[PDB]
């Protein structure tokens, strides 16, 4: 299951849900600008 907002993630293997992206500073899912 994909990862929702503010869940811990890995930018190199980004499993954040559609429209989200793994933050490089915090490594949690944030809104994709």
């Amino acid at each position, epitope marked *: 299951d994909c990862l929702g907002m503010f869940k*811990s*993630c*890995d*930018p*190199e293997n980004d499993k954040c849900c559609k429209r989200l992206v793994c933050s*490089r*500073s*915090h*490594r*949690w899912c944030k809104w994709k*600008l």
Partner: antibody
Amino acid sequence: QVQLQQPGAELLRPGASVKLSCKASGYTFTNFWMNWVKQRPGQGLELIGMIDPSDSETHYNQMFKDKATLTVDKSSSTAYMQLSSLTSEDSAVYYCARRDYYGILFDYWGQGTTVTVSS
Amino acid sequence: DVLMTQTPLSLPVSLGDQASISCRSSQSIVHNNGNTYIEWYLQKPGQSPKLLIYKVSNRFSGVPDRFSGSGSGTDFTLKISRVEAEDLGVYYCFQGSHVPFTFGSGTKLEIKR
């Protein structure tokens, strides 16, 4: 080729301010974190702060929170670092550095601007 | 902010011998995502730093087996085996896990001859 262009050297008077420039080329400027690093003669590297040029999200190291201000100009792909009320303690080499796309390492560096604070 | 201490502050080493540099953090460098973002940089006089090791033990492109990074949690080590004359300079550890990211104090490797 990823390149970060910084002026080699600047001489400033005590009490003045300076806005250091780091001109990025050869990559998508808004998609990589920019970092500024201070290094006094014969001393260590000190991270000043970092900025995400896409939305100017900033994070400052505690020593520089009140002292440094990070901004970007998207139209010229330039990162800036402003210091105010300069003293001889501010004489140092100031580097800009790019974080890689995945946020796991610094991949490219400017050549550093040596600031001299002197009358 | 997270403190990164290096020991020793300077390290004289004979050619062919091994140099070992310790990096200790004030807080675990394990991230909430389970990864550990420790990097090692080498700086030569008058030059910008260059990356050697990232994520504790990953060697950057072209960096030989003889540069080895290890450790976990709060304690990390860079070992440089079979030291060469050109290895002199200041080695810095760095943590990129906890904002704001921080550099270690630096260790100056000097060559004995």
